[PDB]
């Protein structure tokens, strides 16, 4: 019957729990005890970029670490030259309800999506001097929460239909569909080698996928509530997750469970964005209480605060060369910290 | 700065001008969210996202319905929420009360008022007059309700009282609820929204000055 299958599931879940504990011998907080704390970090607003007239919801750095794109509910994408505050483009969207923003690694395309349940890829380097829609990707049932370019032809999108997809932009079709999440998939982080990607959903669990095979390799479950942000460690063998639990957690892929939790009793607000430093030692986390916190990823200690926004930090990115952190908030502004 | 840099700055200034112009144009309109589970008549109050545009007294209105626990964060800046409820059905009325209680007590709608449309009151009138179905079977506290046709009035006032008691309990005065009684053949449903929106905007104006 169904009871036999459920019993097998319970036995296998207990076997997972046994295997995870048989591999737990020394906490990361215990191997890292005898190394030098990084001390306070003093980061200051170097650039503040006016121009958005609504809440900023997403931003992505470019690969060159100079151009970035920001999405706002005013229904416009803006590409910025961060070294000069200038605006390179202003892309008007068909739907103002935008929640994601992806800059292609090459730099030729940008992507956005939201409550329209469509990913729109935009052609930046054309003739005619305008940015026009290259492809409108339809097929998700729920809203698009994240999208990340793999190359100029592949993009992976996470939706609120409890599903991720792998798209071929030229053909405009779902090449691989990833199922397994009970709740709305809110975040998405691609591995440095782009052969794996991790997902965070409202089921309080995170899943590690294989792009080539379409299979869920691992499921990481420790959060008491929904997961809003996710990001690989630069090594590609770990990731961090932010939740409404007011906590960040670091999960290993090889040990196959949690390593360290980043929480303090003084903060009770959810985490909306997570990114890493170049070396992985710093864990930049953005919060609903209108300021970002920097964590010693290896010691679970607050190394600093980035307090400059008078609404919640909704997005957060670190440059590929690690020079700057860019934070956008619901106060229509985004800032660059160095 | 180089000639190229100066021309880039000029491009940026023109982008700023166009952005500001579009932003002002957007400021001249008012944004509404239409909520209501089903069998409520959302599509027939003002006779991924469906957007309905209308204007009353030369004031532009812009209404959205989707087809909620996560995408409701997007609408923290709308002027009002339009919760439509079928007052004729009693099996689904407690579900409507829980839905309204979720909307009212959401941490992002802590400043958003609700224009409540207790819809389909002609069907309620028929059901109450015929007497086949009784509220007391679904809401026990109705046998002990007296109003502050008489019986149909008692029914509709009781239902509105439940909704306004959900609203009053935890509002704290930062946002209120405007309950209106509507049919499916009513044309005065944009004036209602307009009056409620003038009151909402008056509250926000009196709150920029830290007075209310």
């Amino acid at each position: 019957e169904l009871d036999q299958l459920r019993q097998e599931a319970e036995q296998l879940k207990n076997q997972i729990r046994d295997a995870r504990k048989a591999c737990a011998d020394a906490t990361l907080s215990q191997i890292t005890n005898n190394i030098d704390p990084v001390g306070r970090i003093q980061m200051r607003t170097r650039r503040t970029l006016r121009g958005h007239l609504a809440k900023i919801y997403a931003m992505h750095w470019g690969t060159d670490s100079r151009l970035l794109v920001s999405a706002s509910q005013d229904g416009k994408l803006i590409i910025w030259d961060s070294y000069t505050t200038n605006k390179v483009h202003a892309i008007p969207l068909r739907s103002s309800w935008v929640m994601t923003c992806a800059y292609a690694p090459s730099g030729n395309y940008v992507a956005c999506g939201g409550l329209d349940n469509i990913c729109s890829i935009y052609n930046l380097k054309t003739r005619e001097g305008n940015v026009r829609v290259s492809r409108e990707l339809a097929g998700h049932t729920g809203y698009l929460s994240c999208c990340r370019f793999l190359d100029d032809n592949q993009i992976v999108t996470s939706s609120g239909d409890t599903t991720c997809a792998l798209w071929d932009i030229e053909t405009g079709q779902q090449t691989t569909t990833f199922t397994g999440h009970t709740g709305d998939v809110m975040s998405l982080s691609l591995a440095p080698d782009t052969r794996l990607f991790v997902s965070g959903a409202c089921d309080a669990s995170a899943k590690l996928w294989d792009v080539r095979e379409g299979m869920c390799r691992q499921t990481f479950t420790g959060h008491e509530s929904d997961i809003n942000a996710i990001c690989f460690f630069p090594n590609g063998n770990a990731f961090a997750t932010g939740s409404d639990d007011a906590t960040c957690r670091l999960f290993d892929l090889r040990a196959d469970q949690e390593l360290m939790t980043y929480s303090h009793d003084n903060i009770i607000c959810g985490i909306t964005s997570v990114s890493f430093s170049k070396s992985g030692r710093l864990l930049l986390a953005g919060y609903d209480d209108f300021n970002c916190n920097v964590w010693d990823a290896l010691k679970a200690d607050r190394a600093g605060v980035l307090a400059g926004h008078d609404n919640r930090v909704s997005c957060l990115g670190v440059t590929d060369d690690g020079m700057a952190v860019a934070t956008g908030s619901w106060d229509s502004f985004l800032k660059i910290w160095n | 700065v180089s000639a190229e840099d100066k021309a880039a700055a000029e491009r940026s200034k023109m982008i700023d001008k166009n952005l500001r112009e579009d932003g002002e144009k957007a400021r001249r309109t008012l944004r509404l969210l239409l909520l209501g589970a089903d069998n409520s008549g959302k599509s027939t109050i003002v006779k991924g996202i469906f957007e309905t545009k209308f204007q009353v007294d030369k004031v532009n209105f812009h209404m959205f319905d989707v087809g909620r626990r996560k995408w409701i964060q997007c609408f923290n800046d709308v002027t009002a929420i339009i919760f439509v409820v079928d007052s004729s059905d009693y099996n689904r009325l407690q579900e409507a009360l829980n839905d309204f209680k979720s909307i009212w007590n959401n941490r992002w709608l802590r400043t958003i008022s609700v224009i409540l449309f207790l819809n389909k009151q002609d069907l309620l009138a028929e059901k109450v007059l015929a007497g086949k179905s009784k509220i007391e079977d679904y809401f026990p506290e109705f046998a002990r309700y007296t109003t502050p046709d008489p019986r149909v009035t008692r029914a509709k006032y009781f239902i509105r009282k439940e909704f306004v008691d959900i609203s009053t309990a935890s509002g704290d005065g930062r946002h209120i609820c405007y309950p209106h009684f509507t049919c499916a053949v009513d044309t005065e449903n944009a004036r209602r929204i307009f009056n409620d929106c003038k009151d909402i905007i008056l509250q926000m104006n009196l709150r920029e000055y830290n007075l209310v």
Partner: single-chain antibody, 230 residues
Framework: VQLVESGGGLVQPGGSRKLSCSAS????????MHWVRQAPEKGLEWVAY????????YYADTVKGRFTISRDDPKNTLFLQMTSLRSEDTAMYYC??????????????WGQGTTLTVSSDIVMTQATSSVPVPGESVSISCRSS???????????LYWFLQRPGQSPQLLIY???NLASGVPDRFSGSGSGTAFTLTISRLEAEDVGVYYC?????????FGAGTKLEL
């Protein structure tokens, strides 16, 4: 993309003509547009510049006061009102589109020009006036009076090819970057005040007169030209 220039013909000295370039195929309003003329058997000379939005207008010192540039964005026309026409104005008047943002490729399309027949500054010196050279690799040098390397790290050298009876074509922008549609055989290198454009595997339909331009500061100055004849 199409820029069709009109006007042109014979004018006695002291007259006045209006050249019109009609733009089709691209967003004209987003482009700053140049007038670049070429004497009957000489090099390229820059006349005037009108920016997108008509905010900024620059003129050459030779034609300041007696030339006037304007654009009609709804009709996609660029105008050059010429007054007090002299005998040094007999040239082919090219219209060039240029867009300026981070990573742009200015001077990327040149219209087929019109012939008018009327009867400080960086000195770009391309000393090699003619070099004979197919299937081999040849290099062209351009020298600048001052360093083209700005403190922003950008060095503003542009390379153009004018094949026989054809409008000149952008090969390299900022002495490293190839234009779109230009085969990878070309490349450019150098430092301030010393530049080079090497072409590997020289082929037919790839010989003409090569020019170097500075966009470091106005007035834009071209080079004398290097002619590659088989």
């Amino acid at each position: 993309v199409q820029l069709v220039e009109s006007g042109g013909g014979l004018v006695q000295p002291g007259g006045s003509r209006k050249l019109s370039c009609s733009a089709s195929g691209f967003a004209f309003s987003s482009f700053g547009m140049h007038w670049v003329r070429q004497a009957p058997e000489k090099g390229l000379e820059w006349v005037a510049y009108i920016s997108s939005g008509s905010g900024t207008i620059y003129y050459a010192d030779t034609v300041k006061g007696r030339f006037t540039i304007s654009r009609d964005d709804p009709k996609n026309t660029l105008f050059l009102q010429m007054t007090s026409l002299r005998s040094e104005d007999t040239a082919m008047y090219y219209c060039v589109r240029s867009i300026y943002y981070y990573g742009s490729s200015p001077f990327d399309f040149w219209g087929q020009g019109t012939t008018l027949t009327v009867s400080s500054d960086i000195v770009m010196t391309q000393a090699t006036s003619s070099v004979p050279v197919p299937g081999e690799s040849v290099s062209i040098s351009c020298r600048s009076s001052k360093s083209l390397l700005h403190s922003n790290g950008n060095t503003y050298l542009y390379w153009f090819l004018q094949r026989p009876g054809q409008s000149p074509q952008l090969l390299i922008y900022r002495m490293s970057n190839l234009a779109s549609g230009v085969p990878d055989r070309f490349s450019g290198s150098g430092s301030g005040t010393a530049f080079t454009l090497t072409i590997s595997r020289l082929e037919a339909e790839d010989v003409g007169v090569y020019y170097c331009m500075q966009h470091l500061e106005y007035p834009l100055t071209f080079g004398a030209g290097t002619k590659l004849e088989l």
